[PDB]
Coordinates of C-alpha atoms in Angstrom, one line a residue:
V1 CA -15.1 11.0 -25.7
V2 CA -13.1 11.6 -23.2
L3 CA -13.6 15.3 -21.1
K4 CA -9.9 17.1 -21.2
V5 CA -8.2 18.7 -18.2
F6 CA -9.7 21.9 -17.9
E7 CA -13.5 20.7 -19.3
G8 CA -16.4 19.1 -17.5
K9 CA -17.9 19.0 -14.0
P10 CA -14.9 18.7 -11.1
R11 CA -12.5 15.5 -11.2
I12 CA -10.5 15.6 -7.6
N13 CA -7.7 13.8 -8.6
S14 CA -5.2 11.2 -7.2
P15 CA -2.6 11.0 -4.7
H16 CA -6.1 10.7 -2.1
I17 CA -3.4 10.3 1.0
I18 CA -1.0 12.5 1.5
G19 CA 2.3 12.4 4.2
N20 CA 3.9 14.8 6.1
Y21 CA 6.4 15.5 9.4
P22 CA 5.0 16.5 12.8
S23 CA 5.9 20.5 13.2
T24 CA 6.8 20.8 10.0
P25 CA 4.9 23.1 6.9
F26 CA 2.4 20.9 4.6
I27 CA 1.3 21.8 1.5
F28 CA -0.8 20.5 -1.1
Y29 CA -2.8 21.6 -4.1
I30 CA -5.8 19.7 -4.8
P31 CA -5.3 18.8 -8.1
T32 CA -9.2 18.8 -9.8
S33 CA -9.7 18.4 -13.7
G34 CA -13.0 20.4 -15.0
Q35 CA -13.5 24.0 -16.3
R36 CA -12.3 26.5 -14.7
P37 CA -13.8 28.7 -12.4
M38 CA -13.2 26.8 -9.4
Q39 CA -14.4 26.7 -5.8
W40 CA -12.6 24.3 -3.1
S41 CA -13.7 23.5 0.0
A42 CA -13.4 21.3 3.0
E43 CA -14.6 19.2 6.3
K44 CA -12.8 17.7 9.0
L45 CA -9.9 20.2 7.9
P46 CA -7.5 19.4 10.5
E47 CA -6.2 22.5 13.5
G48 CA -2.8 23.9 12.0
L49 CA -3.9 23.7 8.4
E50 CA -6.2 25.9 6.1
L51 CA -7.3 25.6 2.5
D52 CA -7.6 28.6 0.6
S53 CA -10.8 28.3 -1.4
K54 CA -9.7 30.4 -4.3
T55 CA -6.4 28.2 -4.8
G56 CA -7.3 25.0 -3.7
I57 CA -3.9 24.5 -1.7
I58 CA -4.1 23.2 1.8
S59 CA -1.3 24.6 3.6
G60 CA 0.2 24.8 7.2
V61 CA 1.9 22.8 10.8
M62 CA 0.8 19.9 11.9
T63 CA 2.0 19.1 15.3
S64 CA -0.2 16.2 16.7
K65 CA 1.0 12.4 14.6
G66 CA -2.3 10.8 13.3
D67 CA -4.5 9.7 10.3
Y68 CA -6.9 13.2 9.6
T69 CA -9.4 12.2 6.5
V70 CA -10.8 15.2 4.9
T71 CA -13.4 15.6 2.9
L72 CA -13.1 17.9 -0.1
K73 CA -14.8 19.4 -2.2
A74 CA -14.7 21.3 -5.4
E75 CA -16.7 23.4 -7.9
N76 CA -18.0 25.0 -10.9
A77 CA -20.3 25.4 -13.0
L78 CA -21.5 22.4 -14.3
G79 CA -21.4 20.5 -10.8
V80 CA -19.2 19.5 -7.7
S81 CA -17.1 16.4 -6.6
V82 CA -16.6 15.5 -2.8
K83 CA -13.6 12.9 -2.7
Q84 CA -12.0 11.8 1.1
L85 CA -8.4 12.8 1.5
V86 CA -6.5 11.0 3.9
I87 CA -3.4 13.0 5.6
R88 CA -1.0 11.1 7.6
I89 CA 1.0 13.3 9.9
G90 CA 4.0 10.6 11.5
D91 CA 7.4 9.4 9.9
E92 CA 6.1 8.4 6.6
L93 CA 6.6 10.8 3.3
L94 CA 5.8 9.7 -0.3
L95 CA 2.8 7.3 1.1
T96 CA 2.2 7.3 -2.9
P97 CA 5.2 7.5 -6.0
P98 CA 6.4 11.4 -6.6
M99 CA 5.4 12.5 -9.9
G100 CA 7.3 16.1 -11.1
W101 CA 9.9 17.0 -13.3
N102 CA 13.6 16.9 -13.1
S103 CA 16.0 20.2 -14.3
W104 CA 18.4 18.2 -16.4
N105 CA 17.6 17.0 -19.4
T106 CA 15.9 20.4 -20.8
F107 CA 18.8 22.8 -19.5
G108 CA 21.6 20.8 -18.2
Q109 CA 24.5 23.7 -17.2
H110 CA 21.6 26.6 -18.8
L111 CA 19.1 26.5 -15.6
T112 CA 18.0 29.8 -14.2
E113 CA 15.0 31.0 -11.9
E114 CA 13.5 32.5 -14.6
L115 CA 13.5 28.9 -16.5
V116 CA 12.5 27.2 -13.1
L117 CA 9.7 30.0 -13.5
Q118 CA 8.5 29.1 -16.2
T119 CA 8.4 25.2 -16.0
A120 CA 6.3 26.1 -12.5
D121 CA 3.7 28.3 -14.8
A122 CA 3.9 26.0 -18.4
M123 CA 2.4 22.9 -15.5
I124 CA -0.2 25.1 -14.3
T125 CA -2.0 25.8 -17.7
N126 CA -1.0 23.0 -19.4
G127 CA -2.7 19.9 -16.8
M128 CA 0.4 18.8 -15.1
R129 CA -0.8 20.5 -12.1
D130 CA -4.5 19.0 -11.4
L131 CA -3.3 15.2 -12.2
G132 CA -1.2 15.3 -9.3
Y133 CA 2.2 16.5 -11.0
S134 CA 4.3 18.1 -7.5
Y135 CA 7.7 18.3 -7.8
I136 CA 10.4 20.7 -9.6
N137 CA 13.5 19.6 -9.1
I138 CA 16.8 21.5 -9.9
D139 CA 19.4 19.2 -10.6
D140 CA 23.5 19.7 -10.9
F141 CA 25.4 22.9 -11.2
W142 CA 22.8 25.0 -9.6
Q143 CA 25.7 25.7 -7.1
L144 CA 29.7 26.9 -7.3
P145 CA 32.5 24.5 -8.2
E146 CA 33.9 25.1 -4.6
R147 CA 32.6 25.6 -1.3
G148 CA 32.9 29.2 0.2
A149 CA 35.8 29.6 2.8
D150 CA 32.3 30.7 5.1
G151 CA 32.1 26.3 5.2
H152 CA 29.0 26.8 3.4
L153 CA 27.9 25.7 -0.4
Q154 CA 27.7 28.8 -2.9
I155 CA 24.6 29.5 -4.9
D156 CA 25.3 30.2 -8.1
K157 CA 24.4 33.8 -7.9
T158 CA 24.0 34.7 -11.7
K159 CA 21.7 31.3 -12.8
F160 CA 19.8 32.3 -9.7
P161 CA 20.3 35.9 -8.2
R162 CA 17.9 36.5 -6.1
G163 CA 18.8 32.7 -4.4
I164 CA 16.6 29.5 -4.0
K165 CA 14.2 30.5 -1.5
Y166 CA 12.7 32.9 -3.5
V167 CA 12.0 30.2 -6.2
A168 CA 11.5 28.4 -3.3
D169 CA 8.4 30.8 -2.0
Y170 CA 7.4 30.6 -5.9
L171 CA 7.2 27.4 -6.5
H172 CA 5.2 26.9 -2.6
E173 CA 2.1 29.8 -3.4
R174 CA 1.4 27.4 -6.3
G175 CA 1.7 23.9 -4.0
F176 CA 5.2 23.1 -6.0
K177 CA 8.0 21.5 -4.2
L178 CA 11.6 22.3 -4.4
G179 CA 13.2 19.6 -5.6
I180 CA 17.8 19.9 -5.2
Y181 CA 20.9 18.0 -5.9
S182 CA 23.6 17.0 -4.2
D183 CA 26.1 13.7 -3.8
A184 CA 28.7 12.6 -1.7
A185 CA 31.6 13.1 -2.5
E186 CA 33.1 16.8 -2.3
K187 CA 32.3 17.1 -6.3
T188 CA 29.0 16.1 -8.1
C189 CA 29.1 14.5 -11.4
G190 CA 29.5 17.8 -13.3
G191 CA 32.4 18.4 -10.5
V192 CA 30.7 21.2 -8.6
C193 CA 30.5 21.4 -4.7
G194 CA 28.8 18.2 -3.0
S195 CA 28.5 17.3 0.1
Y196 CA 30.4 15.1 1.9
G197 CA 31.9 15.7 5.2
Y198 CA 29.7 18.5 5.5
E199 CA 26.0 17.4 6.3
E200 CA 24.2 18.7 8.4
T201 CA 25.1 22.2 7.0
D202 CA 23.9 21.7 3.7
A203 CA 20.6 20.3 4.8
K204 CA 20.5 23.3 7.0
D205 CA 21.3 25.9 4.1
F206 CA 17.9 23.5 2.0
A207 CA 15.5 23.3 4.6
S208 CA 16.1 27.4 5.2
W209 CA 15.6 28.3 1.0
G210 CA 11.9 25.6 1.5
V211 CA 13.9 22.8 -0.3
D212 CA 11.3 19.6 -0.1
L213 CA 13.3 17.0 -2.0
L214 CA 17.3 16.1 -2.2
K215 CA 18.6 13.6 -5.0
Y216 CA 21.9 12.6 -3.5
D217 CA 24.6 11.2 -5.7
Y218 CA 26.9 9.1 -5.9
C219 CA 29.6 10.4 -8.2
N220 CA 33.5 10.3 -7.0
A221 CA 32.9 7.9 -3.9
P222 CA 34.3 4.5 -2.9
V223 CA 32.2 2.2 -4.2
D224 CA 32.8 0.0 -1.2
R225 CA 29.0 -0.4 0.4
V226 CA 29.4 -0.1 3.8
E227 CA 30.5 3.1 3.6
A228 CA 27.7 4.3 0.9
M229 CA 25.5 3.2 3.6
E230 CA 26.8 5.3 5.6
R231 CA 27.4 7.9 3.8
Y232 CA 23.7 8.1 2.5
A233 CA 22.3 7.6 6.3
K234 CA 24.5 10.1 7.7
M235 CA 23.2 12.9 5.5
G236 CA 19.7 10.8 5.7
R237 CA 19.9 12.4 9.8
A238 CA 21.3 15.4 8.1
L239 CA 17.8 15.7 6.4
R240 CA 15.6 14.3 9.5
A241 CA 17.4 16.9 11.7
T242 CA 15.8 20.1 10.0
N243 CA 12.9 21.6 10.4
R244 CA 11.4 20.6 6.9
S245 CA 9.8 17.6 6.0
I246 CA 12.0 16.6 3.1
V247 CA 12.0 13.8 0.4
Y248 CA 15.2 12.2 -0.1
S249 CA 16.1 11.1 -3.7
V250 CA 19.6 7.8 -3.2
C251 CA 20.9 8.4 -6.5
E252 CA 23.9 5.2 -7.4
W253 CA 22.2 3.5 -9.6
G254 CA 21.7 0.6 -8.4
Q255 CA 25.0 -1.0 -8.2
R256 CA 24.7 -1.7 -4.0
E257 CA 20.8 -3.0 -4.1
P258 CA 20.1 -0.4 -2.7
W259 CA 16.4 -1.9 -2.5
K260 CA 17.4 -3.5 0.4
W261 CA 19.2 0.0 2.4
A262 CA 18.0 2.9 1.1
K263 CA 14.3 2.6 3.1
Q264 CA 16.4 1.9 6.2
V265 CA 18.9 4.8 5.8
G266 CA 16.4 7.4 5.4
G267 CA 15.9 7.2 1.7
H268 CA 12.0 7.5 0.0
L269 CA 13.7 6.2 -3.3
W270 CA 16.5 4.8 -4.9
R271 CA 17.7 5.0 -8.5
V272 CA 17.6 1.0 -9.6
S273 CA 19.4 1.6 -12.5
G274 CA 22.0 3.3 -14.9
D275 CA 20.1 6.1 -16.3
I276 CA 17.8 6.0 -18.6
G277 CA 18.0 7.0 -22.3
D278 CA 15.4 8.3 -24.6
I279 CA 16.0 4.4 -26.5
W280 CA 13.7 1.3 -26.6
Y281 CA 16.6 -0.8 -26.9
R282 CA 19.9 -0.5 -25.6
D283 CA 22.3 -2.7 -23.0
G284 CA 24.1 -0.4 -20.7
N285 CA 25.4 -2.6 -18.7
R286 CA 26.8 -4.0 -21.5
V287 CA 28.8 -1.0 -23.8
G288 CA 28.4 2.0 -20.8
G289 CA 26.2 4.6 -20.7
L290 CA 22.5 5.2 -21.4
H291 CA 20.2 1.9 -21.1
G292 CA 16.5 1.6 -23.1
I293 CA 13.5 1.4 -21.6
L294 CA 13.0 -2.5 -22.7
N295 CA 16.5 -2.8 -20.2
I296 CA 15.4 -0.5 -17.1
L297 CA 12.1 -3.2 -16.8
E298 CA 14.1 -6.2 -16.4
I299 CA 15.7 -4.8 -14.0
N300 CA 13.1 -3.7 -12.0
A301 CA 10.6 -6.7 -12.6
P302 CA 12.4 -8.9 -10.2
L303 CA 12.3 -5.9 -7.6
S304 CA 8.5 -5.4 -6.4
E305 CA 8.8 -6.7 -2.7
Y306 CA 11.3 -4.2 -1.7
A307 CA 8.7 -1.2 -3.3
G308 CA 5.6 0.3 -1.3
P309 CA 4.5 3.5 0.5
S310 CA 7.3 5.9 1.9
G311 CA 10.3 4.0 -0.5
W312 CA 10.0 3.2 -4.0
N313 CA 12.1 1.8 -6.5
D314 CA 13.2 4.5 -9.0
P315 CA 13.9 3.0 -12.9
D316 CA 14.1 6.8 -13.8
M317 CA 13.1 9.0 -15.1
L318 CA 10.1 9.0 -18.6
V319 CA 11.4 10.1 -21.3
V320 CA 8.0 10.6 -22.7
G321 CA 7.0 13.0 -25.9
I322 CA 11.5 14.0 -26.0
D323 CA 11.5 12.5 -29.2
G324 CA 15.3 12.3 -29.8
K325 CA 15.4 16.1 -29.1
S326 CA 17.8 16.6 -26.0
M327 CA 20.0 19.2 -25.0
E328 CA 16.3 9.6 -33.0
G329 CA 13.7 8.6 -29.7
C330 CA 10.9 6.8 -29.7
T331 CA 7.6 6.0 -31.4
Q332 CA 4.3 7.4 -29.7
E333 CA 2.9 3.7 -28.5
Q334 CA 6.7 3.2 -27.3
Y335 CA 6.1 6.4 -24.9
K336 CA 2.7 5.2 -24.5
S337 CA 4.0 1.7 -22.5
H338 CA 6.5 3.5 -21.0
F339 CA 4.2 5.3 -18.8
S340 CA 1.7 2.7 -18.4
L341 CA 4.5 0.5 -16.9
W342 CA 6.0 2.9 -15.1
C343 CA 2.0 3.5 -13.4
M344 CA 1.9 -0.4 -13.1
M345 CA 5.5 -0.6 -11.3
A346 CA 4.8 2.5 -8.4
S347 CA 7.4 4.0 -10.0
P348 CA 8.1 8.0 -9.1
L349 CA 6.4 10.3 -12.7
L350 CA 9.3 12.5 -13.5
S351 CA 9.4 14.1 -16.7
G352 CA 12.1 15.1 -18.2
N353 CA 11.2 16.4 -21.2
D354 CA 10.6 20.4 -21.5
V355 CA 6.8 21.2 -19.8
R356 CA 7.1 24.0 -21.6
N357 CA 6.5 23.6 -25.0
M358 CA 4.6 19.8 -25.5
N359 CA 2.4 18.5 -28.1
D360 CA -1.5 17.5 -27.1
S361 CA 0.1 13.8 -27.5
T362 CA 2.4 14.0 -24.9
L363 CA 0.2 15.2 -22.8
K364 CA -2.3 12.5 -23.3
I365 CA 0.1 10.4 -22.0
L366 CA 1.0 12.5 -18.8
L367 CA -2.1 13.2 -18.0
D368 CA -3.7 9.9 -18.1
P369 CA -5.7 9.8 -15.1
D370 CA -7.4 6.3 -14.8
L371 CA -3.4 5.6 -15.6
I372 CA -2.0 7.6 -12.6
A373 CA -4.7 6.7 -9.9
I374 CA -3.5 3.2 -10.5
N375 CA 0.2 5.1 -9.4
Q376 CA -1.0 6.6 -7.0
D377 CA -3.0 3.4 -5.6
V378 CA -3.0 3.8 -1.5
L379 CA -1.8 0.1 -1.5
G380 CA 1.3 1.1 -3.0
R381 CA 2.5 -2.9 -5.0
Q382 CA 4.9 -2.2 -7.5
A383 CA 3.1 -4.7 -10.1
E384 CA 4.7 -8.2 -10.7
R385 CA 6.0 -9.1 -14.0
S386 CA 3.8 -12.1 -13.5
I387 CA 4.5 -13.6 -17.1
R388 CA 7.3 -12.5 -19.5
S389 CA 6.3 -14.5 -23.0
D390 CA 8.7 -14.6 -26.2
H391 CA 6.5 -11.5 -27.7
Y392 CA 4.5 -10.0 -24.7
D393 CA 5.1 -9.4 -20.6
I394 CA 1.2 -9.6 -18.3
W395 CA 1.9 -7.9 -15.1
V396 CA -0.1 -7.6 -12.6
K397 CA -0.7 -5.0 -10.0
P398 CA -3.0 -5.0 -6.9
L399 CA -5.1 -2.3 -5.8
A400 CA -6.7 -1.5 -2.3
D401 CA -10.3 -1.7 -3.2
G402 CA -9.8 -5.5 -3.9
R403 CA -9.3 -5.4 -8.0
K404 CA -6.3 -6.5 -9.8
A405 CA -5.1 -4.5 -12.2
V406 CA -3.4 -6.1 -15.3
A407 CA -1.2 -4.9 -18.1
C408 CA -0.2 -6.9 -21.4
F409 CA 2.7 -5.5 -22.9
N410 CA 3.4 -6.1 -26.2
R411 CA 7.2 -6.0 -27.0
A412 CA 7.5 -7.0 -30.4
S413 CA 7.7 -5.1 -33.2
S414 CA 3.9 -7.3 -34.7
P415 CA 1.2 -7.5 -33.5
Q416 CA 0.2 -9.7 -30.7
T417 CA -3.0 -10.8 -29.4
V418 CA -3.7 -12.1 -25.9
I419 CA -5.9 -13.9 -24.9
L420 CA -6.7 -13.9 -21.1
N421 CA -9.0 -16.3 -19.0
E422 CA -9.2 -17.4 -15.8
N423 CA -6.2 -20.1 -15.9
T424 CA -4.1 -17.0 -16.9
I425 CA -3.2 -15.5 -13.5
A426 CA -4.2 -16.5 -9.7
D427 CA -7.4 -15.3 -8.8
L428 CA -7.8 -13.2 -11.8
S429 CA -12.0 -12.1 -11.4
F430 CA -13.7 -12.0 -14.5
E431 CA -17.5 -10.4 -13.4
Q432 CA -17.1 -7.0 -13.5
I433 CA -13.6 -6.0 -16.2
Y434 CA -13.0 -2.1 -16.7
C435 CA -10.6 -1.3 -20.0
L436 CA -9.0 1.6 -19.8
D437 CA -8.6 1.6 -23.8
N438 CA -12.2 2.7 -24.1
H439 CA -13.6 3.6 -20.6
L440 CA -15.9 1.2 -21.1
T441 CA -17.1 -1.6 -17.6
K442 CA -18.5 -5.5 -18.1
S443 CA -20.4 -6.7 -15.2
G444 CA -22.3 -9.4 -14.7
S445 CA -21.1 -11.6 -17.5
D446 CA -20.6 -14.9 -18.5
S447 CA -17.9 -15.1 -20.2
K448 CA -14.3 -16.1 -18.4
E449 CA -12.8 -14.6 -21.6
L450 CA -10.7 -11.4 -22.6
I451 CA -9.6 -11.3 -26.4
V452 CA -6.5 -8.5 -26.1
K453 CA -5.8 -7.2 -29.5
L454 CA -2.5 -5.5 -29.4
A455 CA -0.7 -3.3 -31.5
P456 CA 3.3 -3.2 -32.4
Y457 CA 4.9 -2.0 -28.7
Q458 CA 1.6 -1.4 -27.2
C459 CA 0.5 -2.1 -23.5
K460 CA -3.6 -2.0 -22.8
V461 CA -4.4 -2.1 -19.0
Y462 CA -7.5 -3.6 -17.4
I463 CA -8.8 -3.4 -13.7
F464 CA -10.6 -6.9 -12.5
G465 CA -12.9 -7.7 -10.4
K466 CA -15.5 -5.6 -8.4
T467 CA -15.0 -3.4 -5.2
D468 CA -15.1 -3.9 -1.6

């Protein structure tokens, strides 16, 4: 049996590397599975940082650039977990893909302080925080339609009666990071105030409120690519001029090949496509509107070379478990494959579901420790789709330890069998295979073949090779 998130001896989970700018606030909750109560400690925690042994949160400010290797320890009644953490202080954020939640699908124009706080509380108690989900992102309509005559964005005080900073403080106390939303135009997609021409003011306000991520949309801006690049560069400079490490999420729907320029202008992730729908197949580029999961896979597949630490291709939100709720859907197996492939592609793992009231089956997917560990692998390679056959894909992701994760993904509505052998993919080591389906390792085998049986829509993942 697989141990649930709050049972058994401690297991310190991914990420095992974290980046932050020098002389900016640093917060990291150590994601840790296992029964509570739990106690944390550290060896070689650098000057500038402190660990709260009761809460598992590392916080402070580091002023010197470099890589610092810390040994973390988590202890409960049943045992101990010891794990290395590398802290890189420099100009590199999101050394692993960001994980978290975006508010739009659940709350739309009706987000409030209370509802953000409820969401944070639920992420603590449902296991998500302990599997590495850390970003809680406010989307459109937190602000009023017009800029204040004073030159500043106006917080909707009906929604946020104590301001955005209150929310940020609540989140930070619990190891979460706060995301906010604006647009590179006078008006956002929803028609409230954007940041064009006021980038410096807006960035300084975001930083004063304790914002940790900005999603920067491109509604109402000129199609022109040089203009887009310049508007994104301008906000990037504005963010770097503040006293915080603010993650910069570029959202111009993949129309100007952002994979070729977004990282260069300061982005840490960039949308590669139009919006994802809670649907398996829909060609949004043909009929307009939402794209299906399969369609976004086709778009992202050839973009692996552009992704890596501090610069991720963003295939949009995880629709896992939405079940056609909104505010028809996909099958459980389809949702599982969607999650699996987002993991393999080193995608942001940002849930768009209501995380306060998910069912066990949805959390079983979102909390999968092996798949998340693959997503968070420090090498940061986006899996290549090495084979796209009539019915199935083979995706391959090299890992930092020298092994290769291999995902066999059945697109079809009928069962399919895939026979992996030494000729399927180049440099695939059969001497040791870890199977994620049953958590078993086959070692020192004479067999150079693996029969993979897939249900409709199913993705099975394996890790090939011995560690260095």
